[PDB]
Amino acid sequence: KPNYALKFTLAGHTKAVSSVKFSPNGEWLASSSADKLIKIWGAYDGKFEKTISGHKLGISDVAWSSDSNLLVSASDDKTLKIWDVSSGKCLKTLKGHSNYVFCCNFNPQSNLIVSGSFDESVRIWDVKTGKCLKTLPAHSDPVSAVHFNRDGSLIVSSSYDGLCRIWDTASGQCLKTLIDDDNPPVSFVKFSPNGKYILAATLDNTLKLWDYSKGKCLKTYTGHKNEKYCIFANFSVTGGKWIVSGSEDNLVYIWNLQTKEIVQKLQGHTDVVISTACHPTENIIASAALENDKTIKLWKSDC
């Protein structure tokens, strides 16, 4: 079992936090918020670095380029913005979605951005030009998450319509649709580190690890509370093999990947833990909570 202990508590956002992400080089934490801001913090001691502003409405998600030099944000103002982190400047505004943009990610090459929206589409954008390359009629309800696999050749998307879909990046074709009988809304999905599985959260207090080639559920992780909010889940790859998620009972849950047992619950937050992120090289977790709690917390474990 890990022994995550609280090291720093960070404050500054003035409305609900929506997303926290560590930069791939491990140097920074980015947070996004309904207060329309992105904030950058030192990954190791939480030292505030800068505020990045320009969206006209709140932000649901942020994501880093592989060289840690760019951010992309997804906003209720129906746009994504590409940011130069060092300058704070908006390089491009990605226009095309017809409603709130809920989720975004760079591909590993970071020449493309994928986005998902309340407008039920997935869009693929050229980073250099800001042009939308493809619009995929991906789902029949808001798109809750979009993620590239480790070589960039596939996209996975999830939706409140109950589906997870696998897309060929280059062609835009749907290669696979994952289905559940009770059809609970899918609130989050991402590829596993080795690219063979997808981890999917559903709004019935359940995380599932799917082999999407076989269309088979291999693991289920339960015990937490998740019936309302889009709460990310993470693979922890630096020490023991853990699954990490926030929860609507104000705790961070950590599970053993293979046995599905809860190995730790992190207490401290005073509201829903809306987002967590795992550091790329150290056993460090960042957690963020909703507008009653107002903090981001940094935790460290020996394994």
Ligand SMILES: O=S(=O)(Nc1cn(C2CCCC2)cn1)c1cc(Br)cc(Cl)c1O
């Ligand atoms: O999910 S994984 O991509 N690979 C994987 C799967 N399993 C078992 C076998 C099938 C079900 C779970 C073991 N390793 C992965 C997860 C974590 Br946390 C860390 C790393 Cl390093 C990693 O590679």
